[PDB]
Amino acid sequence: QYIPTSGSVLANFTRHEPTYDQIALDAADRLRNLMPHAYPAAYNDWGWLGDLLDSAISMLPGVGTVYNIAKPLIKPAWNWLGNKVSDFFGNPVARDG
Amino acid sequence: AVVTAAGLAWLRQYLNPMGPDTTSVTGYPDGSAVTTCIADYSNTFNVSFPPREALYCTGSSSSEKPTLVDADNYAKIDKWSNYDITLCVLALPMLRNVVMLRLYPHTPTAFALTEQTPNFPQRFPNWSVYSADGTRFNNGDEPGYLQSYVYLPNVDKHLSAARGYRLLSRGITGIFSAPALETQGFVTACQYLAEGSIQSQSIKSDAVRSVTVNSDGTVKNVESSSQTVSSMPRYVFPLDGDNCAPSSLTETYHQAYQSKATDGFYMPVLSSSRDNPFHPPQPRAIAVYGSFLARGCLDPVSEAHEADGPTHDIYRLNVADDVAPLFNTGVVWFEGISPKFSLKLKTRTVLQYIPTSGSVLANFTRHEPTYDQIALDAADRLRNLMPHAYPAAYNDWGWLGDLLDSAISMLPGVGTVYNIAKPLIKPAWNWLGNKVSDFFGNPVARDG
Amino acid sequence: AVVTAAGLAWLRQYLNPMGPDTTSVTGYPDGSAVTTCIADYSNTFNVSFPPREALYCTGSSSSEKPTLVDADNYAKIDKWSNYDITLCVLALPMLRNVVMLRLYPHTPTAFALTEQTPNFPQRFPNWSVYSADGTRFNNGDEPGYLQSYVYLPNVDKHLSAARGYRLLSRGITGIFSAPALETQGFVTACQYLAEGSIQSQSIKSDAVRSVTVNSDGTVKNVESSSQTVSSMPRYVFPLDGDNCAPSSLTETYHQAYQSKATDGFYMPVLSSSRDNPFHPPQPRAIAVYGSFLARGCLDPVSEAHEADGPTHDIYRLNVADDVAPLFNTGVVWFEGISPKFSLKLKTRTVLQYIPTSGSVLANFTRHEPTYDQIALDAADRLRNLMPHAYPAAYNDWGWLGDLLDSAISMLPGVGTVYNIAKPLIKPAWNWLGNKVSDFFGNPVARDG
Amino acid sequence: AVVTAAGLAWLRQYLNPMGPDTTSVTGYPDGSAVTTCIADYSNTFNVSFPPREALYCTGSSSSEKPTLVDADNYAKIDKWSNYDITLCVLALPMLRNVVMLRLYPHTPTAFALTEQTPNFPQRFPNWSVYSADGTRFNNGDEPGYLQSYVYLPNVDKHLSAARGYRLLSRGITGIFSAPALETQGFVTACQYLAEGSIQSQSIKSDAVRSVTVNSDGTVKNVESSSQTVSSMPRYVFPLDGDNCAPSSLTETYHQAYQSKATDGFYMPVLSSSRDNPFHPPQPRAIAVYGSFLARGCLDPVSEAHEADGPTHDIYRLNVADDVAPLFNTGVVWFEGISPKFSLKLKTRTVLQYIPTSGSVLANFTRHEPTYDQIALDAADRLRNLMPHAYPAAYNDWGWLGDLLDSAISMLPGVGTVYNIAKPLIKPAWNWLGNKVSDFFGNPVARDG
């Protein structure tokens, strides 16, 4: 993100929509220590992300919770070498690439 | 079956480019499925009667020598400054050179152009003088008018680094001011489609017919090159110069805007087509169609006179640009205004790009292509209803958005979910007599 | 959601220009919101075998000397008058010069044109002779056919004083008569879109390669101007001349009209597009595309032979006009008719103008711009169903208006309020065998 | 209110030309009411690294002497064969010359073309060599790449004997094979509209300015023919050569296809317009727009420098053809593939003709003109959703026909009888990582 200076090129491409979300920041801070450092090159578009990992980590911050229980979170096993890979919720990850 | 938020936002920014509500830019709702970068250029210029240092000659004086400043012929232009003047602004669909300004001692009968290509056309802060007899001006002639181009350099820089472009919307605002007790004058504005095209004019090739008397190698070279050929291609605009006088425009177009000069103007330039395809950048020399003089083969003539048939004069502007096709040409006249006027021109041009790889535009990308047929149909329908211009301060129209757009949204086909929104009545945009009624009969009291 | 009265009136006048019901003229239903003047030109001409006083030569005889009358070569044309002749009428979309007439001794294999520009093309009462070998005719050659143009002068006068125009509808009627016991012959008619455009043909520039032997100033001017350049721009029509023979048209187009010569013809020329934008008047020289001879770069060739690639012959008509774009080209043949025939041509051309200020048209103004999307969609849909021509006396079709227009009006989208109007069946326009059925199966007994 | 069988068949053959289900050919659903003949051309070519006997020079060596084979410069091309190569295939909308093949030692930064017209462009089995410095190659230079054209002769023969034509559908399949342990490489494919037009480039006419010193007949012929004129008209394609590198296409277009080289490709070329009118055959020399160098009148300049304004380089291909307007241009790159590769190209081109009388096509006639507005609207809507290419073996898509066509068939307007067919979700065509999901979320396991 940039703050354009006056009369600069960036000034022609402006997003005037500043949003505020404390829950997202807290969730990112919490998830910092859980996410793996890297994945196989073809392992984009993780199924467990977004509404399972983000949700299941979203009630823990404080008690800022409206949905009681989303999904219990289990310790994943990212054993890419032996093909015995399990995601954050125990679902096996068959090699798709 | 209903309009989306993106379609409504595009409709707002296309019909009301300078409206305060329009803050974020949105792309054309056609689902182009390409990486696009939307650029919004807002520019402000303070035009007034130029001083002598900003005036340049267009005649053969500045032939190879660059622009020549006026030399003590400025007395005649001061004589202009004694009386009331006329100020024309012509917004052709050129991307660069958003408008062309012209200053006249008095209202002309037509929008004339010089048959000879002017030398060094000047950009806004500088002007270029043209003679009173409709020819280029050298020092020592009789000045007829001043002409200038309002240039946007960032548009040029970004158009260089783009594989395709398309103009999304354009608006021009004309906030007018003058000293107290000098607020006379009238303002007229009108848009109309002048569909230009790449054309060549018929020129005559110089011939070599020479029955020589050389000693022994007398070739007698009668090489009759007196044939009509085609000049270089140029983008020619069918701008009806002879019918661009303010009175003609007022009589012809019903949606033309008229008011007192102090009201200024606010012209949202509108497209004339329902589709807005991307086009590759291709600058080309611009020219304006004139009128033919010799009838030629318009009457039964010989084979030899077919060449000098009806040939329309082409007025070269000595300016190169790439135009936005199917966009209206705007023209506004300030007649009888004080010579000590001050016009604050504010232009907003928002247009979409397809960035080339490794270019600057690639760092500012909107990966959200939306599709909305209803919005496009509504814009096409509204094209013929909206006024050509408004007073400079008449932004943020109440009747827009959920009354005009809605009440025009069920008519397209029968793609209707809401039975009746609001009956639409013919508005009366009588800005001169203050009896202004909007699209739904609600009176418009002067808020500016 | 329903068609308006103005839309229906425009549909009637566009599909049935010469129908007796159509009395008042209506504009294009698009809500153009401009001051318009609608002009209706009805003209009648009595064509028959010309006398000698109306015949003129086209060859180099009339090069600078004006039109040369035929000198006792008229005996050959009387020899034509001994047997049965053929009469072609070709209605190009040109505004002036509504039709081109041609008289042949016998049916040609194609609609040929001369490679050399004819001298002084003649307007209707006068004809111009062309040789039998497909070249221009000088006195003392073998005459091949006669050609004439049917000119509308009021159209020219009004087009001069107009800022924009658009053709609304055009119809041509061919009431045929002949002496009793001489009513032989057949009539064929067909419309098809020949989308012309402004094009230039590739011509060769004459070069000056001169290794002179001058005393001391021997320039040795080898100025190789043998380059291919572009001729003057002309409006070129892709008229398939080689495929305009009557048999070819009958085989190709299903809606082509055929009948006995005594039935005459009535061709309402139809548009090929759903939109009819205004255009500025711009007369230009007309020409017709031919066929290429040298294949050139259609095969792997050297760089030098790229210039003589596939170059299509362009046949200059030595006639200037402005055309109505997207309007069909009509062509009708009277084959094997008596040489003592008499054709009463009746043309009706109604077209809209935008008057210029202080012009004559400004005194005749229709300030009523209407909008009707349903009518435009219905016309677009009906474009492919209507026959190309009818017998000369078959105006005022019963099935039109509230049966055909209605029964085609619910199909566009679903913009329908009346559930079922009338099922539409495929008509059989077998005018030759008298077994004619209309669009709804109702037989058409001969009323004329 | 519902799609017909003919409309569905046309939609299938237009979206999936090489699908096994498509067996019979169907015409364009517009009810043209003309006699038409539909021709389907299926061709197969086996492209691999050429031997020396198939290589020809393009420089001045083959100026008037026909194609010159390479003379022991083939050692450098063997040096190419030592490492991995790049293979581009460019499918312009030309009817003949279905694709252009190019072989590079390594991936270029752009799709360059030579400023000088090549000599004797070679058709597929033969190639033509171009130098590494972007110029034509003579024997003894440094070879840069090989170029070839894939020619369809039956198309030429049938186009000769046709009054009108229109391209119905076109598909190109690229089955790739290589020796085991040599299956490296990537394949990219992309379509985009490059709307060509008939244009002329501005050339300079050679002048004769000669102040002679002849004895008595000293004409002093200063005939300043140094004017800019227009070259011959050519069909010019705005192909963005500088932005045709694989990475640029991948970044720009969302529907671009990427995969491993072994997957091959299958590109159904799609139209860019909702209408497909017939056009008369008119072969013309093809050329590609380049980029301008001199800014010219893009800046305030003198009258003399208007001539050298922004003039875009035009690259002549020395190939003549008639193009299919409004059809996308396809481009596919095989990067880093083994030099011992083998590409089986399979092209299917189905197009409609209007036979001329007494021609061969007249013996093969389909007298069944159907009309289907829903199919045309559905194709127009689907234009922006379909991927640009698929793996070579991914024909017979399950999701097509009654799921994609149906689920897209109620959206056009409200012309709907079946309430809900199937919700449509955004597919993920991630062929590289094997995580491919169709238009309805159903995974696509690799079946080939």
Nearest Cα of chain B lies from the Cα of C215 at a distance, in angstroms, of 8
For the residues of B246-308, what is the DSSP string, one character each? HHHHHHHBTT-EEEEGGG--EEEE-BSSS----B----EEEEEE------GGGSS--SGGGTT
CA distance B15 to B399: 12
Q: Cα Rg for chain A, rounded, in angstroms?
A: 18
* SS3 at position B380: helix
Ramachandran region of residue A76, left (φ > 0), alpha (ψ -120 to 50) or beta? beta
H-type alpha helices, D241-307? 246-252
Which of C74, C134, C85 has the alpha carbon at shortest distance from C107? Answer: C85
CA distance B14 to B16: 6
Of the candidates C119, C208, C233, the beta carbon closest to that of B200 is on C233
Do the Cβ atoms of D328 and D170 come closer than 8 Å? no
Place of tokens 């007796």: C20
Q: Do B212 and D214 touch (CB under 8 A)?
A: yes
Return residues 55-94 of A near D (CB < 8 Å): none
Distances (CA, A) of D75 to C308, D70, D131, D144, D209: 37, 10, 15, 13, 50
Which of D258, D425, D430, D437 is most worth mutating to test chain A (most A CB atoms within 10 A of its CB)?
Answer: D430
Return residues 226-265 of B near C (CB < 8 Å): 227-230, 238, 240, 242-243, 245, 247-248, 251-255
Q: Do A13 and B157 touch (CB under 8 A)?
A: no
**Contact status of D217 with chain A (Cβ, < 8 Å):** no
Which of B67, B87, B89, B94 has the alpha carbon at shortest distance from B151? Answer: B94
Sheet strands (E) in D37-84:
37-47, 55-57
Q: Which two tokens stand for residue B193?
A: 């489609």
CA distance C164 to C351: 11
Q: Do B303 and C66 touch (CB under 8 A)?
A: no
Instruction: Count CB pairs under 8 A between chains A and D.
Output: 18
Do the Cβ atoms of D56 and D70 come closer than 8 Å? yes
- Partner residues linked to C44 by β-bridges: C346
CB neighbours of D35 closer than 8 A, spacing ≥ 6? C251, C252, C253, C254, D354, D355, D362, D365, D367
CA distance D321 to D307: 31
Dihedral angle at the C-alpha atoms of A30, A33, A37, A39, nearest 10 degrees? Answer: -60
Q: Which residues of B touch A9 (CB under 8 A)?
A: 154, 157, 360
Return residues 409-448 of B near C (CB < 8 Å): 413-414
C-alpha B340 chain-centroid distance: 25
Which of D353, D344, D390, D352 has the alpha carbon at shortest distance from D15? Answer: D390
Helix then strand then coil, in percent of chain B rounded to 5, is 15, 35, 50
Do the Cβ atoms of C41 and C167 come closer than 8 Å? no
Nearest Cα of chain B lies from the Cα of D135 at a distance, in angstroms, of 24
Distances (CA, A) of D368 to B112, B350, D26, D35: 57, 49, 9, 8
Nearest Cα of chain D lies from the Cα of C223 at a distance, in angstroms, of 6
Q: Do C63 and B253 touch (CB under 8 A)?
A: no
Q: Do B37 and A10 touch (CB under 8 A)?
A: no
Nearest Cα of chain A lies from the Cα of D239 at a distance, in angstroms, of 28
CA distance D344 to D188: 16
Q: What is the DSSP letter of B30?
A: B
Interchain touch A–C (≥3 Cβ pairs closer than 8 Å):
no
* SS3 at position D124: coil
Q: What is the DSSP letter of A5?
A: P
Return residues 30-59 of A near D (CB < 8 Å): 42-45
**Contact status of B223 with chain C (Cβ, < 8 Å):** yes
In chain A, the residue whose alpha carbon lies closest to the alpha carbon of B154 is A9
Resolution (angstroms) equals 3.3
Side chain identity, residue C397: W
CA distance B12 to B18: 10
Nearest Cα of chain B lies from the Cα of C333 at a distance, in angstroms, of 26
Backbone angles phi, psi at B245, to 5 degrees: -65, 150
Q: Do C64 and B254 touch (CB under 8 A)?
A: no
Q: Do D206 and C200 touch (CB under 8 A)?
A: no
Q: Do B303 and C118 touch (CB under 8 A)?
A: yes
Backbone angles phi, psi at D135, to 5 degrees: -135, 170
Instruction: State which H helix or E strand residue C14 sits in.
Output: helix C5-15
In chain B, the residue whose alpha carbon lies closest to the alpha carbon of C368 is B254
What is the side-by-side order of every strand in the sheet holding C342-355?
Answer: C37-47, C342-355, C162-177, C266-269
**Contact status of B360 with chain C (Cβ, < 8 Å):** no
Q: Do B282 and D202 touch (CB under 8 A)?
A: no
CA distance D55 to D124: 11
Which of C230, C41, C61 has the alpha carbon at shortest distance from C129? Answer: C61
CA distance D327 to C72: 59
- Partner residues linked to C91 by β-bridges: C330
Q: Do A14 and B360 touch (CB under 8 A)?
A: no
- By the 10 Å C-beta count (0-12 exposed, 13-18 middle, 19+ buried), D354 is classed as buried
In chain C, the residue whose alpha carbon lies closest to the alpha carbon of D353 is C252
In chain D, the residue whose alpha carbon lies closest to the alpha carbon of A40 is D433
C-alpha D360 chain-centroid distance: 28
CA distance D113 to D110: 9
Neighbours of chain A (3+ CB pairs under 8 A): B, D
Breaks in chain D follow which residues, C to N over 2.5 Å?
none
Q: Do A12 and B360 touch (CB under 8 A)?
A: no
Do the Cβ atoms of B237 and B288 come closer than 8 Å? yes
Breaks in chain B follow which residues, C to N over 2.5 Å?
none
Which of A2, A97, A86 has the alpha carbon at shortest distance from A36? Answer: A86
CA distance D316 to D286: 6
CA distance C284 to C236: 10
- By the 10 Å C-beta count (0-12 exposed, 13-18 middle, 19+ buried), C356 is classed as buried
Do the Cβ atoms of C332 and C175 come closer than 8 Å? no
C41: how many CB neighbours lie within 10 A of its CB? 17
**Contact status of C180 with chain B (Cβ, < 8 Å):** no
**Contact status of B301 with chain C (Cβ, < 8 Å):** yes
**Contact status of C221 with chain D (Cβ, < 8 Å):** yes
Do the Cβ atoms of B191 and B269 come closer than 8 Å? yes
CA distance C23 to C9: 10
- Partner residues linked to C99 by β-bridges: C150
Interchain touch A–D (≥3 Cβ pairs closer than 8 Å):
yes
* CB neighbour burial string for B177-208, b if at least 16 within 10 angstroms, e if fewer: bbeeeeeebbbbbbbbbbbbeebbbbbebbbb
**Contact status of A7 with chain B (Cβ, < 8 Å):** no
Neighbours of chain B (3+ CB pairs under 8 A): A, C, D
In chain D, the residue whose alpha carbon lies closest to the alpha carbon of A96 is D434
Of the candidates B23, B24, B39, the beta carbon closest to that of A12 is on B39
Of the candidates D63, D205, D354, the beta carbon closest to that of C252 is on D354
Which of C3, C15, C6, C2 has the alpha carbon at shortest distance from C350? Answer: C15
**Contact status of B338 with chain D (Cβ, < 8 Å):** no
**C234-237 vs C197-199, strand pairing mode:** antiparallel
Dihedral angle at the C-alpha atoms of D250, D253, D258, D261, nearest 10 degrees? Answer: -70
Do the Cβ atoms of C210 and C346 come closer than 8 Å? no
Q: Do A45 and D432 touch (CB under 8 A)?
A: no
CA distance D244 to D155: 28
C-alpha D83 chain-centroid distance: 28
Do the Cβ atoms of C308 and C204 come closer than 8 Å? no
Q: Do C119 and B303 touch (CB under 8 A)?
A: yes
Q: Which residues of A touch D430 (CB under 8 A)?
A: 44-45
Of the candidates C248, C255, C312, the beta carbon closest to that of D356 is on C248
Q: Which two tokens stand for residue B403?
A: 């009354």
Place of tokens 């005939």: D223
CA distance D230 to C202: 9
**Contact status of C193 with chain D (Cβ, < 8 Å):** yes
CB neighbours of A37 closer than 8 A, spacing ≥ 6? none
Nearest Cα of chain A lies from the Cα of D330 at a distance, in angstroms, of 27
Of the candidates C33, C233, C283, the beta carbon closest to that of B384 is on C33
